Amino acid sequence: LEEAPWPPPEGAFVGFVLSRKEPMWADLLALAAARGGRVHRAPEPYKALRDLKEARGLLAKDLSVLALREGLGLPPGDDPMLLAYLLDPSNTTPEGVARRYGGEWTEEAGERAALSERLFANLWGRLEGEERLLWLYREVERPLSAVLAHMEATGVRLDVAYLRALSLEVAEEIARLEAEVFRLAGHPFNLNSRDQLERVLFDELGLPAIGKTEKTGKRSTSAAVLEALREAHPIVEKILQYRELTKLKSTYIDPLPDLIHPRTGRLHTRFNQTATATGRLSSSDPNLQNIPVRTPLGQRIRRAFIAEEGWLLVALDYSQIELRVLAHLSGDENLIRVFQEGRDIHTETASWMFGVPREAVDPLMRRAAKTINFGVLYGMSAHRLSQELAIPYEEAQAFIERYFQSFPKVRAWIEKTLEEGRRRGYVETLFGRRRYVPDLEARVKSVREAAERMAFNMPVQGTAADLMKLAMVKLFPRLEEMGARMLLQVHDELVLEAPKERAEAVARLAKEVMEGVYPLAVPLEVEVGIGEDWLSAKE
DNA sequence: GACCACGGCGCC
DNA sequence: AAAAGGCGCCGTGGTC
Ligand SMILES: Cc1cn([C@H]2C[C@H](O)[C@@](C)(COP(=O)(O)OP(=O)(O)OP(=O)(O)O)O2)c(=O)[nH]c1=O
Ligand SMILES: [Mg+2]
Ligand SMILES: [Mg+2]
């Protein structure tokens, strides 16, 4: 490639080097561009940003986020990572994509710009004729990256002072619990080390080991094991409570406050677009898709996520969505009827599990029932199921058989999906997003059957994810015009931020965009709440 | 100071 | 732990 003075012609491909992986926190070390056998290197990266109309190339969204941070409206365009991910979702890094489609991910901006141009040419080649994947790239992924760049640059407000104070309280509680554990053990040890804890529990206290760890075959001290040992010794309960508190403290309460960005005063995650095997997004640095919600302390942490002053959060969450998707994909009449009658399978299982009326079921019960409903659907064993409901194995088995006989066509769809996956080497969502599952023909049963569970889950989970992505693409422009903001996506949920005066109107509109994203054989319903914090907005 | 594998566990 | 699927981050232990 011939050297050429900055700036590049229009439609050139950018390369850029960051001091670190997080766009919002990174120094832009270099910027380059390449077009028609040329490479232009920017003498000064930051100012050189101003000369671009579009971030076009590998990891375009990241450079776009960094541009937004500097007050520049530089939207992301074509990105070869998105083409590769669509061809095969195991294409998740530029290191791999480069090696696979004609180059090498280096640490120099010019070489990255050139790699972007080459990779785009080649990958675009692979996608000619793949009309459904092309529809996904133009109508969903490429536009979605623009939406994601904005969400990343916006961030969410956090109640820092509140978390600081909460930390001090939980610290004292943790001290009480570890002091108890050591007294019962008859000596101190690192309660954080599951190796040391294993020795205390199963060698010194001589408790019955229940399970082994996967890789190294040690005696497990997992929550499930400890739960089966609640009655066997007083120390077990204290260890479980200790685990809850230190998990929440070390993962959320302590780290989060230190991640408030100086410029924005807000908390910024990354929304990874080519990270999962099913087509879902992931979130990292920090992960804001796994903020606690289940337990009392978890809920207090969720309360820390608040709206800007004079604004409200709007939380919208698809109802029983993967079950609705499954009704459509499978064509099961009984299942479709359930949704056309406005029934609620999670609530129905909850009232059965806890032997209470439908009206007596609370949120924690329903959430319990959800892990049961999806667990069983995607292949949970009778033994495990019996352990979690704490019912006899025989009853666990009856639950699973009635579950599937209640919806006859589901098992048929599964078998059809696996057969097709064996012939073609891949399975696909409603929109033709693919996941290759070669192990469908493994000669080892356990490997083969693990692959089968991955294979028939993918169309379901991936269609739900397709729907949300499309809903976000349709929704974003409508929010901009109303002066509202899109903050987070948590798979089948969206968290927005609206001026108080317009929160109500924004909520109704978002609900309708999401419900009408793409009509199915069953209605899509969206539960929506409004509130000053994330907890309040979900009900 | 940085890797990693591992067990473990938070959420969807 | 166990035939649920999909993620990312924690501390420990071990290494470089
Ligand atoms: C808890 C859980 C979730 N999911 C999946 C399957 C599911 O449809 C979703 C897309 C969203 O989760 P959700 O909103 O909590 O639940 P629903 O949408 O089904 O119902 P509502 O409460 O919203 O009415 O992730 C699992 O695969 N395993 C799990 O343990
Ligand atoms: Mg939902
Ligand atoms: Mg949800």
XYZ file of C-alpha atoms (C1' of nucleotides) and ligand atoms in Angstrom:
599
model
C 0.000 0.000 0.000
C 1.267 3.435 -1.029
C 1.632 6.070 1.689
C -0.744 9.001 1.244
C -1.300 12.208 3.247
C -4.098 12.429 5.785
C -7.019 12.749 5.336
C -8.424 9.733 3.420
C -11.045 9.812 0.666
C -14.640 9.150 1.720
C -15.700 5.558 2.359
C -12.186 4.533 3.391
C -11.630 1.823 6.009
C -10.235 2.869 9.397
C -7.712 1.187 11.643
C -7.028 2.409 15.169
C -5.030 1.388 18.221
C -6.343 1.833 21.761
C -4.337 2.009 24.982
C -6.892 -0.455 26.328
C -9.928 -2.474 25.263
C -12.661 -0.301 26.831
C -13.623 2.516 24.402
C -14.850 4.921 27.101
C -11.580 4.635 29.075
C -9.043 4.347 26.253
C -6.431 6.710 24.854
C -6.484 6.723 21.041
C -2.850 5.907 20.260
C -3.149 5.896 16.460
C -5.569 6.307 13.566
C -5.192 5.269 9.931
C -7.373 4.732 6.865
C -7.133 2.816 3.593
C -8.817 3.033 0.203
C -7.984 2.038 -3.355
C -4.503 0.735 -2.612
C -3.568 3.591 -0.278
C -2.982 4.008 3.446
C -3.195 7.389 5.172
C -1.777 7.703 8.686
C -3.002 10.523 10.919
C -0.201 12.659 12.398
C -2.436 13.403 15.385
C -5.138 10.749 16.056
C -7.682 12.789 18.049
C -7.971 15.797 15.735
C -7.870 13.427 12.767
C -11.147 11.951 14.062
C -12.909 15.164 13.014
C -12.164 14.377 9.357
C -14.320 11.233 9.297
C -17.974 10.885 8.323
C -18.225 7.245 9.379
C -16.334 4.632 11.408
C -15.977 1.912 8.777
C -14.024 -1.271 9.516
C -13.001 -3.748 12.207
C -14.493 -2.925 15.619
C -16.178 0.162 14.132
C -18.486 0.532 17.143
C -15.581 0.934 19.570
C -14.053 3.851 17.647
C -17.558 5.295 17.299
C -18.049 5.137 21.073
C -14.734 6.899 21.619
C -15.784 9.568 19.127
C -19.084 10.142 20.946
C -17.082 10.486 24.147
C -15.238 13.394 22.514
C -18.485 15.014 21.371
C -18.348 13.805 17.768
C -21.242 12.214 15.900
C -19.205 9.554 14.124
C -21.572 6.603 13.482
C -20.292 3.053 12.808
C -20.760 1.582 9.330
C -19.608 -1.657 7.714
C -17.675 -3.926 10.067
C -16.142 -7.200 8.843
C -16.579 -8.684 12.345
C -20.360 -8.529 11.806
C -20.129 -10.254 8.417
C -17.953 -13.027 9.854
C -20.121 -13.472 12.939
C -23.184 -13.914 10.721
C -21.391 -16.535 8.595
C -20.343 -18.414 11.732
C -20.938 -17.087 15.260
C -17.776 -18.801 16.503
C -16.114 -15.861 14.737
C -15.912 -13.645 17.825
C -12.448 -12.024 17.774
C -10.525 -10.094 15.112
C -7.499 -12.314 15.783
C -9.464 -15.346 14.611
C -11.428 -13.615 11.863
C -8.191 -12.211 10.418
C -6.444 -15.585 10.383
C -9.492 -17.194 8.836
C -10.318 -14.677 6.101
C -6.997 -13.312 4.891
C -4.650 -11.407 7.171
C -3.278 -10.848 10.653
C -4.449 -8.663 13.537
C -1.387 -6.572 14.406
C -1.017 -3.613 16.789
C -0.455 -0.926 14.161
C -3.272 1.279 12.860
C -2.207 1.391 9.211
C -1.987 -2.398 8.958
C -5.383 -2.627 10.674
C -6.976 -0.254 8.153
C -5.618 -2.356 5.289
C -6.757 -5.577 6.976
C -10.238 -4.065 7.313
C -10.425 -3.314 3.589
C -9.227 -6.791 2.581
C -11.371 -8.680 5.079
C -14.474 -6.741 4.060
C -13.929 -7.518 0.381
C -13.490 -11.245 1.054
C -16.264 -11.644 3.644
C -18.675 -9.709 1.430
C -17.771 -12.299 -1.189
C -18.764 -15.172 1.084
C -22.144 -13.521 1.732
C -23.278 -13.159 -1.888
C -26.323 -15.390 -2.309
C -26.853 -15.679 1.439
C -29.931 -13.471 1.205
C -31.323 -14.043 4.704
C -27.947 -13.373 6.330
C -27.619 -10.264 4.168
C -31.012 -9.110 5.410
C -29.794 -9.619 8.977
C -26.634 -7.574 8.368
C -28.316 -4.581 6.698
C -31.599 -4.521 8.611
C -30.343 -5.624 12.046
C -26.628 -5.919 12.920
C -25.145 -2.922 11.085
C -27.813 -0.462 12.246
C -27.824 -2.061 15.716
C -24.143 -1.253 16.208
C -25.052 2.426 15.858
C -27.696 2.058 18.569
C -25.196 0.222 20.786
C -22.537 2.900 20.345
C -24.973 5.474 21.698
C -26.014 3.320 24.660
C -22.355 2.709 25.541
C -21.494 6.409 25.348
C -24.527 7.411 27.440
C -24.040 5.139 30.448
C -26.347 4.891 33.463
C -26.428 6.871 36.711
C -25.343 5.132 39.915
C -25.964 6.095 43.542
C -22.340 5.933 44.662
C -22.692 7.280 48.203
C -25.360 4.649 48.822
C -23.086 1.800 47.714
C -20.192 3.104 49.843
C -22.366 3.027 52.964
C -23.824 -0.345 51.983
C -20.309 -1.794 51.765
C -19.491 -0.880 55.365
C -22.664 -2.561 56.631
C -22.109 -5.762 54.643
C -18.485 -5.869 55.802
C -19.616 -6.151 59.434
C -22.166 -8.831 58.553
C -19.484 -10.816 56.717
C -17.271 -10.628 59.807
C -20.058 -12.127 61.945
C -20.484 -15.003 59.495
C -16.809 -15.906 59.070
C -16.258 -15.638 62.833
C -19.054 -18.181 63.280
C -17.680 -20.472 60.573
C -14.244 -20.521 62.199
C -15.673 -21.249 65.647
C -17.586 -24.241 64.281
C -14.529 -25.367 62.329
C -12.473 -24.992 65.504
C -9.879 -22.833 63.744
C -9.478 -20.054 61.155
C -8.746 -20.613 57.475
C -9.296 -18.821 54.166
C -13.061 -19.185 53.785
C -12.681 -17.792 50.252
C -10.648 -20.818 49.167
C -12.870 -23.737 48.207
C -9.832 -26.040 48.505
C -9.323 -25.213 52.171
C -13.079 -25.335 52.757
C -13.239 -28.775 51.130
C -10.693 -30.094 53.603
C -12.550 -28.639 56.590
C -15.982 -29.877 55.491
C -15.187 -33.392 54.260
C -11.966 -34.338 56.081
C -12.162 -32.605 59.467
C -15.922 -32.423 60.035
C -16.329 -35.655 58.079
C -19.433 -34.572 56.194
C -20.709 -36.655 53.280
C -19.313 -35.495 49.936
C -22.073 -35.350 47.334
C -20.471 -34.389 44.029
C -17.152 -33.899 42.243
C -15.807 -30.961 40.251
C -15.620 -31.339 36.483
C -11.965 -30.747 35.534
C -9.876 -31.849 38.524
C -12.318 -34.164 40.299
C -12.235 -32.584 43.751
C -15.145 -32.855 46.181
C -17.501 -29.992 45.305
C -18.543 -27.322 47.799
C -21.011 -25.771 45.354
C -24.228 -24.147 46.547
C -26.229 -27.167 45.377
C -24.008 -29.482 47.427
C -24.134 -27.255 50.504
C -27.918 -27.101 50.180
C -28.128 -30.889 50.294
C -26.034 -30.631 53.475
C -28.028 -27.935 55.298
C -29.357 -30.341 57.919
C -26.061 -32.181 58.380
C -24.234 -29.403 60.250
C -24.724 -25.810 61.527
C -21.633 -24.552 59.678
C -23.243 -25.210 56.300
C -25.934 -22.535 56.578
C -23.374 -19.948 57.664
C -21.188 -20.798 54.676
C -24.134 -20.276 52.315
C -24.934 -16.868 53.788
C -21.241 -16.002 53.683
C -21.135 -16.948 49.991
C -24.066 -14.685 49.151
C -22.641 -11.638 50.909
C -19.053 -11.877 49.635
C -20.193 -12.620 46.080
C -22.342 -9.475 46.003
C -19.765 -7.325 47.802
C -16.718 -8.344 45.746
C -18.540 -8.359 42.399
C -20.889 -5.353 42.606
C -20.842 -3.214 45.756
C -17.082 -2.572 45.773
C -16.034 -2.499 42.088
C -18.947 -0.510 40.631
C -18.470 2.803 42.483
C -14.838 3.009 41.273
C -15.932 2.783 37.623
C -17.788 6.096 37.457
C -16.352 7.968 34.481
C -14.899 11.453 35.203
C -16.402 13.250 32.182
C -19.913 11.794 32.254
C -20.181 10.971 35.951
C -21.932 7.798 34.798
C -21.295 4.044 34.544
C -20.494 2.656 31.077
C -20.647 -0.970 29.953
C -19.719 -2.484 26.597
C -22.349 -4.245 24.508
C -20.539 -7.045 22.723
C -22.169 -7.763 19.380
C -20.143 -10.786 18.210
C -19.691 -12.692 21.461
C -22.349 -15.423 21.778
C -23.123 -18.624 19.873
C -26.857 -17.905 19.661
C -27.034 -14.273 18.524
C -27.582 -12.733 21.943
C -25.501 -9.753 22.989
C -23.197 -9.939 25.970
C -22.159 -7.141 28.303
C -18.777 -6.529 29.923
C -16.359 -4.173 31.664
C -18.513 -4.098 33.711
C -21.219 -6.655 32.955
C -24.538 -4.869 33.576
C -26.664 -7.779 32.358
C -26.191 -9.690 35.636
C -26.923 -7.068 38.288
C -28.463 -8.813 41.350
C -32.253 -8.940 41.750
C -33.189 -12.232 43.437
C -32.318 -11.786 47.134
C -32.862 -8.921 49.620
C -29.265 -7.662 49.431
C -29.337 -8.110 45.665
C -32.403 -5.894 45.470
C -30.693 -3.177 47.506
C -27.862 -3.213 44.977
C -30.313 -2.919 42.083
C -31.743 0.181 43.794
C -28.402 1.892 43.177
C -29.171 2.219 39.455
C -31.110 5.467 39.245
C -32.409 8.040 36.762
C -30.851 11.448 36.200
C -32.553 14.155 38.261
C -35.882 15.117 36.703
C -35.959 11.857 34.742
C -37.399 8.363 35.261
C -36.308 4.880 34.222
C -38.631 2.862 32.017
C -38.141 -0.903 32.178
C -39.755 -3.051 29.479
C -39.515 -6.847 29.564
C -40.981 -9.382 27.133
C -43.350 -11.807 28.834
C -42.397 -15.498 28.765
C -40.673 -14.744 25.498
C -38.755 -17.916 24.621
C -41.961 -19.871 25.319
C -43.842 -17.651 22.861
C -41.101 -18.106 20.267
C -41.294 -21.878 20.793
C -45.056 -21.848 20.196
C -44.452 -20.204 16.819
C -41.508 -22.375 15.738
C -43.185 -25.620 16.804
C -46.768 -24.865 15.796
C -48.063 -26.597 18.922
C -51.771 -25.848 19.242
C -52.042 -26.342 23.007
C -49.127 -23.960 23.564
C -50.481 -21.329 21.171
C -53.874 -21.562 22.881
C -52.215 -20.854 26.223
C -50.930 -17.514 24.947
C -54.100 -16.595 23.045
C -55.970 -17.083 26.329
C -53.498 -14.876 28.194
C -52.394 -17.662 30.533
C -49.045 -17.630 32.342
C -47.024 -20.851 32.505
C -44.476 -19.485 34.984
C -47.242 -18.556 37.426
C -48.969 -21.920 36.947
C -45.807 -23.867 37.748
C -45.140 -21.597 40.726
C -48.541 -22.281 42.300
C -47.935 -26.008 41.815
C -44.406 -25.976 43.247
C -45.393 -23.992 46.326
C -48.886 -25.473 46.554
C -50.499 -22.038 46.637
C -53.258 -20.452 44.520
C -52.273 -18.458 41.421
C -53.068 -15.266 43.328
C -50.796 -16.298 46.212
C -47.715 -16.528 43.978
C -45.165 -13.743 44.521
C -42.214 -12.659 42.311
C -39.584 -14.814 44.060
C -41.809 -17.867 43.620
C -42.410 -17.109 39.948
C -38.709 -16.603 39.278
C -38.086 -19.939 40.981
C -40.609 -21.487 38.600
C -38.887 -19.957 35.566
C -35.628 -21.826 36.105
C -37.815 -24.925 36.402
C -39.798 -24.252 33.223
C -36.825 -23.466 30.983
C -34.622 -25.992 32.765
C -36.999 -28.828 31.955
C -37.612 -27.608 28.408
C -33.921 -27.578 27.495
C -33.239 -31.053 28.866
C -32.948 -31.055 32.666
C -32.635 -34.540 34.187
C -35.226 -36.041 36.511
C -32.592 -36.427 39.232
C -31.553 -32.766 39.202
C -35.159 -31.585 38.922
C -36.120 -33.756 41.890
C -33.297 -32.205 43.901
C -34.261 -28.598 43.209
C -37.966 -29.042 43.982
C -36.963 -31.407 46.792
C -39.489 -34.008 45.648
C -39.000 -37.731 45.010
C -37.242 -38.760 41.789
C -40.436 -40.458 40.612
C -42.446 -37.242 40.953
C -39.751 -35.244 39.171
C -40.063 -37.733 36.321
C -43.859 -37.399 36.195
C -43.547 -33.616 36.048
C -41.245 -33.789 33.038
C -43.416 -36.264 31.115
C -46.660 -34.336 31.683
C -44.845 -31.124 30.769
C -44.092 -32.436 27.278
C -47.337 -34.351 26.701
C -49.150 -31.092 27.470
C -47.432 -29.639 24.406
C -47.113 -32.595 21.958
C -45.578 -30.767 18.971
C -42.637 -29.448 21.001
C -40.877 -32.819 21.049
C -41.639 -33.202 17.341
C -40.059 -29.838 16.575
C -36.979 -30.768 18.598
C -36.477 -33.995 16.634
C -37.004 -32.246 13.283
C -34.515 -29.557 14.302
C -31.871 -32.119 15.260
C -32.351 -34.148 12.079
C -31.917 -31.058 9.919
C -28.899 -30.054 11.998
C -27.286 -33.429 11.328
C -27.679 -33.175 7.545
C -26.665 -29.553 7.069
C -24.195 -29.193 9.931
C -26.069 -26.243 11.426
C -29.327 -25.030 12.944
C -30.978 -21.644 12.514
C -33.354 -19.070 13.979
C -36.583 -17.753 12.472
C -34.548 -15.237 10.457
C -31.857 -17.675 9.359
C -29.104 -16.845 11.850
C -26.904 -19.949 11.945
C -24.979 -21.930 14.521
C -22.866 -24.873 13.381
C -23.102 -27.953 15.608
C -20.707 -30.622 14.243
C -20.871 -32.788 17.386
C -24.429 -33.778 16.461
C -22.705 -36.858 15.051
C -20.245 -37.492 17.873
C -19.846 -41.209 18.570
C -19.715 -40.568 22.322
C -23.254 -40.327 23.683
C -22.599 -37.682 26.347
C -20.844 -35.384 23.866
C -23.461 -35.980 21.188
C -26.302 -35.287 23.615
C -24.663 -32.140 24.982
C -24.500 -30.936 21.376
C -28.157 -31.811 20.873
C -29.150 -29.621 23.817
C -27.057 -26.775 22.383
C -28.530 -27.285 18.927
C -32.251 -27.211 19.675
C -31.905 -24.412 22.223
C -30.263 -22.127 19.667
C -33.204 -21.467 17.329
C -35.378 -20.606 20.328
C -32.935 -18.399 22.260
C -31.624 -16.907 19.027
C -35.034 -15.953 17.644
C -35.922 -14.168 20.869
C -32.611 -12.301 20.539
C -33.326 -11.497 16.881
C -36.665 -9.991 17.882
C -35.180 -7.761 20.581
C -32.372 -6.527 18.321
C -34.905 -5.633 15.636
C -37.092 -3.967 18.264
C -34.122 -1.867 19.378
C -33.399 -0.779 15.813
C -37.021 0.286 15.281
C -37.269 1.870 18.727
C -34.094 3.963 18.818
C -35.139 6.627 16.286
C -38.539 7.056 17.945
C -36.853 7.702 21.313
C -34.414 10.269 19.912
C -37.339 12.308 18.604
C -39.014 12.207 22.032
C -35.821 13.274 23.787
C -35.542 9.949 25.620
C -32.537 7.637 25.977
C -31.840 3.936 25.566
C -29.607 2.809 28.442
C -29.364 -0.985 28.703
C -30.461 -4.213 27.105
C -30.703 -7.283 29.338
C -31.582 -9.853 26.670
C -35.385 -9.616 26.587
C -35.531 -6.379 28.582
C -34.788 -2.722 27.815
C -34.070 0.045 30.298
C -34.751 3.559 29.008
C -34.470 6.992 30.590
C -37.129 9.627 29.939
C -37.858 13.155 31.134
C -40.475 12.855 33.907
C -43.011 14.779 31.829
C -42.719 12.244 28.998
C -41.988 8.979 30.832
C -45.596 7.852 30.501
C -45.809 8.524 26.757
C -42.381 6.995 26.149
C -43.423 3.870 28.044
C -46.582 3.300 26.009
C -44.806 3.847 22.688
C -41.902 1.535 23.548
C -44.352 -1.152 24.624
C -46.106 -1.017 21.251
C -42.923 -0.967 19.168
C -41.662 -4.030 21.039
C -44.949 -5.968 20.899
C -45.374 -5.250 17.189
C -41.750 -5.825 16.188
C -42.620 -8.924 14.143
C -46.027 -10.621 14.549
C -46.007 -14.346 15.362
C -48.613 -17.092 15.723
C -48.966 -15.871 19.305
C -49.087 -12.309 20.665
C -45.920 -10.756 22.075
C -46.669 -9.071 25.393
C -44.363 -6.613 27.137
C -44.541 -5.775 30.838
C -43.552 -2.163 31.449
C -42.823 -0.263 34.643
C -41.685 3.260 35.491
C -39.642 4.434 38.479
C -36.771 6.457 39.936
C -34.571 3.343 40.156
C -34.195 0.022 38.326
C -35.846 -1.982 41.100
C -38.873 0.336 41.215
C -39.255 0.310 37.436
C -39.705 -3.476 37.268
C -42.492 -3.409 39.764
C 2.630 -6.577 37.644
C 0.362 -10.201 33.966
C -1.173 -14.666 32.265
C -4.329 -18.967 32.977
C -7.507 -22.712 34.612
C -10.761 -23.663 37.881
C -14.677 -23.641 40.783
C -18.208 -20.951 41.762
C -22.213 -17.920 40.958
C -24.552 -13.467 39.372
C -28.188 -12.631 35.456
C -31.378 -13.787 31.262
C -23.264 -32.343 41.510
C -27.008 -34.041 38.407
C -28.537 -34.470 30.444
C -31.144 -27.229 30.992
C -29.219 -23.394 27.289
C -26.487 -18.543 26.919
C -23.146 -15.240 29.086
C -18.873 -12.475 32.348
C -16.365 -11.716 36.825
C -14.833 -13.128 41.264
C -10.838 -15.158 44.349
C -7.622 -18.865 44.707
C -3.744 -21.311 43.184
C -0.067 -21.448 40.089
C 3.028 -19.571 36.991
C 5.995 -16.188 34.549
C -34.599 -16.995 34.275
C -34.243 -17.730 33.012
C -34.503 -17.125 31.722
N -34.176 -17.797 30.581
C -34.479 -17.207 29.280
C -35.748 -17.528 28.490
C -36.535 -16.291 28.585
O -37.699 -16.200 27.830
C -35.492 -15.177 28.488
C -35.334 -14.729 27.072
C -35.905 -14.016 29.370
O -35.973 -14.275 30.746
P -37.130 -13.746 31.682
O -37.614 -12.388 31.211
O -36.562 -13.622 33.144
O -38.296 -14.791 31.702
P -39.503 -14.756 30.714
O -39.317 -13.665 29.613
O -39.612 -16.124 30.074
O -40.827 -14.481 31.520
P -41.164 -13.092 32.169
O -40.857 -13.131 33.687
O -40.333 -11.938 31.518
O -42.639 -12.843 31.979
O -34.214 -15.768 28.947
C -33.576 -19.133 30.635
O -33.277 -19.717 29.588
N -33.319 -19.726 31.910
C -33.640 -19.050 33.072
O -33.414 -19.579 34.155
Mg -39.209 -11.588 30.095
Mg -36.035 -10.400 31.282
